[PDB]
Amino acid sequence: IDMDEDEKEMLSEARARLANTQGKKAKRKDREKQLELTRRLSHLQKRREL
Amino acid sequence: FDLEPSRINQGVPVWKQEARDERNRKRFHGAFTGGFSAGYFNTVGSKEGWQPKSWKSSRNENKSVHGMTIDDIMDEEDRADQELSKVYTSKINTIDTSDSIGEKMLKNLGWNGHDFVISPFQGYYDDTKLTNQAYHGIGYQADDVFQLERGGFGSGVLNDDGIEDQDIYDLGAPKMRYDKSINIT
Amino acid sequence: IQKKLLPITKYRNQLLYAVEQNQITIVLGHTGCGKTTQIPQFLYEAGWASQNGIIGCTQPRRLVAKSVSERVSLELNSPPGSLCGYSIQFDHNVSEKTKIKYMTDGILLNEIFFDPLLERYSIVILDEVHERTLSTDLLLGVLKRILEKRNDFRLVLSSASVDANKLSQFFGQDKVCTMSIEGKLFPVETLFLQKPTENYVDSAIETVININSTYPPGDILVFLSGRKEIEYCIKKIEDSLIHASEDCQTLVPLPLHAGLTVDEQMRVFNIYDGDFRKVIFSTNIAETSITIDGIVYVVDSGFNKQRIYNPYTRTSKLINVPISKSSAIQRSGRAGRTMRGKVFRLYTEKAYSLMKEEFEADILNCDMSPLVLFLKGLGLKNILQFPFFVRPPTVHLMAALEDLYLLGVLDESGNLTDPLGIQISNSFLDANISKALLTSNQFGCTHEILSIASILTAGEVFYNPTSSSKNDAFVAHSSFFANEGDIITALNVFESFVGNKKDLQWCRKNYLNYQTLRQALDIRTHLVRFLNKFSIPTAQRLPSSDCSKILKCLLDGFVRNVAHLQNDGSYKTIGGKQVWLDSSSVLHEKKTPWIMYSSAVESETQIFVKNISKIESFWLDKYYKR
Amino acid sequence: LKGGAWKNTEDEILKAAVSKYGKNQWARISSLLVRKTPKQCKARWYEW
Amino acid sequence: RVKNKNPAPIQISAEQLLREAVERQDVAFVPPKINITDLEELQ
RNA sequence: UCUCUCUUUGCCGGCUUAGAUCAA
User: Fold this and answer.
1) Which of B58, B83, B180, C286 could form an S-S bond across to C282 if both were Cys, CB 3.0 to 4.6 Å?
2) Where in the cell does this protein reside (chain D)?
């Protein structure tokens, strides 16, 4: 019923493992796109408030 | 100096520790520390530079031109190992360790032992030269076949050891590995 | 009613007669029979404490002393401390109206130091002397002297071991009566292996499984060498539980050792309802002061860990030793309290035939430097004149005396040097730590050295969890990492601890042991009184951040304990000893060129040092030259 | 350390990892089960 | 008593593992749509 | 002929020594 505590943590690790996908370093390109979107939105907002 | 963020080490002992970082960067610097660059930038000089001080001697102006001292020309590594390399004196520690004045102390104690007196603590100090047990039972007799106990530059700390790295010139184990007699019958 | 049920009530008149007609009486009995709690009541009822007389019973354990004092106070229907009180080292709860006083051995030695004849006590009872503590045997030696001088003073000796003949010879047969109480124990049968075992834990686990599968219900108490085997037994017992059969009880494993937190030591007493069979993996804790009922079957490995100190190297090591015959008998008799029980000792009777009968005393297994300070304070020039029950090793005595001489407490003639020597003799602590405190007056920084001493004597002020909160503990500690070593880290932690209103939630958040800090508070208060006994002010603090002169005082206190880094990662002591830094210390890999430690604990391969603090070479050079 | 008795949770994680990775990446699969080695994972998959 | 070794009424299955793995995904990210209030932001 | 719903519904990164290794 209560599989200790270590088995819970390895199950959680495996759960995060199986649905990772998206490669490994593909998390950089989308992050840069989101940062660029935020920077442009801030720039447009400053233009609009001016 | 804030000792850098110390949380990086956590546990994870030696064989899993990432690499040492001089400036939170995975790199080496110094010729004898594993870096492919030594000095400022493969050079002797420094960032600011270095200039000699003005000189003037007239039997009264050279008095202001003092001598040279140890510290003023060394650097942080040099001072660190200068502190590391200072070992001398000792004397008193060696005299009363490992008795001399203690014999006079025994004179104070009125030893008068003639035949010395021993305590079972000394049988336990003999136990310092007996065993620490090897997870065996009280009555376990154990076995005698199962008990066991030049220089130059190095081959490289990562190049490991093998049959390759032993002394080809061997003259050890003169007689300690050899019996003095053998039963013939 | 519980007073009358104990077997000792029927011997009350006889014990009183023996106490009155004999100057010294040896009482032999089993723990929990009433000797600890009912003898004071019995002799108070007789009238020994009448007319200003006091009944002083020595309990060498602080927790045992306090618990027995509270139990006696409550059993007599008197307010605590009014008639019966307790006084343990650096913690006094007594009163002028108190008649039954429970006292520690060290404080009583101090009272002997101030009062050589103990005029306020007519009778003193020595209890739990079977553990043969250093303070206990030194007190026994002085007590032979006071009974020699005082004919009115009476002694009652209570012991759980058969040593009465040796005490009779030491004390003189004409003045001691050897009496033995007749308790009751259900007959316990021993079972022995025909052949010596190779793996005693595997033999124990085999017997534990056979007991579970073939014997009636009953908790099994095991005896194991040390704390390293506990987790191995947990793991094997868990695997056996996974593969347990329906005909076998649900067998719960329970650790029991000295290093556990108190709540873990309380987990064993928990009652497991249903078909649950307890097994107590105890190293040596379940030998004294431990009373789990329902213990039926005990399997004894015959090995116990202990501590031996090396004077030549000033180290201490935890070694495995075969148990003594007395320990085996005690372990066998531990089972059988409530119903009949069986013991399974994992060896042969031929192995039993060779072990030495009783474990050697702690006066023969501890550091005698406090003992030599005590005797020299009483005024004994020649150590051989004192009536030792067992002669201590001469080489240990000369080693301790030479250590004391190089410390400066003794002159070339072996007498106390200056006010320093006598003041050190008056100190409860060791001479090494006391030297810094006594010399701090010359430098006006007594406060921080006092805090350092209180932290050192109280113990470890940090708590290290075994779960993931260890990282949280590191972060909790991350605010107070001092570049100069662990000692100044402890000073900073202590300063902010008193600067945080003694908040217990703060101690939980920072994973800090509040009990140790309180004990350090009591230590510093009593040492403040100790210095004020010499009219030394204790308001001296260093207003500057320069801890250098505090380090001068420490180097005066830890002259021998210096070391410098070697290329191999180890450190070379000034005495040419290879030591290794403990992982706990902050300066584990900082590669500090010169280091200073306090305590050394030695393992089978590496000698580890504790309480690491960095130093500078020129301080040491200037200190050694003068 | 390494090994044990192959609890059901380990076996099901093994099945899922084989589904996601294939039958030729036993090192990557064994990274999930910290108590087992790639040889052990391969032996269990091909034997049970 | 944390010692109820009774086999669980429900056993962890692989398909459960993958289903509760994929539940970790959310909807596609919703960015605040850019507003074009004059010809400049249009061109 | 509208509206909604269901169902039917054919359907729209490569190579090499598996690139090479892996104990808290």
Assistant:
1) C286
2) Nucleus
